[PDB]
């Protein structure tokens, strides 16, 4: 809203860099769309334009770093760990086996243009996997979402 905490701002700050490859401090339609579409999704240009236009308070056709915080802040407000995880878990779980492996997680992560190594992926799963079965389940997903 009109009052964002340093917590949510920092979260998007890191993600922002992951989205802003040129680190120009601004995100374009092609960028936000390219990264988003990389999430294994194939949204139409109309879907992206509307997405941006919604946050584009100036309708300049582009969103700056500040505007980015708005997009994430909009969803962060109604953060529905319930549906959010459900849909997200499905995206990461291509096979829909109910468990997220390193291969898959690494694949989706790489799609966002993020260069993660096997060690980083293992830590992500291991740190998120309470049982340490080398995979992340739905219950573990929400448990890992812990803001602390």
């Amino acid at each position: 809203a009109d009052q964002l905490t340093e917590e949510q701002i920092a979260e998007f700050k890191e993600a922002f860099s992951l989205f802003d490859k040129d680190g120009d401090g601004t995100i374009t339609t092609k960028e936000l769309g390219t990264v988003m579409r990389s999430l294994g999704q194939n949204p139409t240009e109309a879907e992206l334009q509307d997405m941006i236009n919604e946050v584009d308070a100036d309708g300049n056709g582009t969103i700056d770093f500040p505007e980015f915080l708005t997009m994430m802040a909009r969803k962060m407000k109604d953060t529905d760990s319930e549906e959010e995880i459900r849909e997200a878990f499905r995206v990461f779980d291509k096979d829909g086996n109910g468990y997220i492996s390193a291969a898959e997680l690494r694949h989706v992560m790489t799609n966002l243009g993020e260069k993660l190594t096997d060690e980083e992926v293992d830590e992500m799963i291991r740190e998120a996997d309470i049982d340490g079965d080398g995979q992340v389940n739905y219950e573990e997903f929400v448990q890992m979402m812990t803001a602390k």
Binding site: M76, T79, I85, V108, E114, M124, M144
Partner: peptide, 22 residues
Amino acid sequence: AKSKWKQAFNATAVVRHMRKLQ
């Protein structure tokens, strides 16, 4: 590590939410 989770997590969540509002 947790930051990465928020990234992909939020990315998919916001996408479904922001797009849905459309």
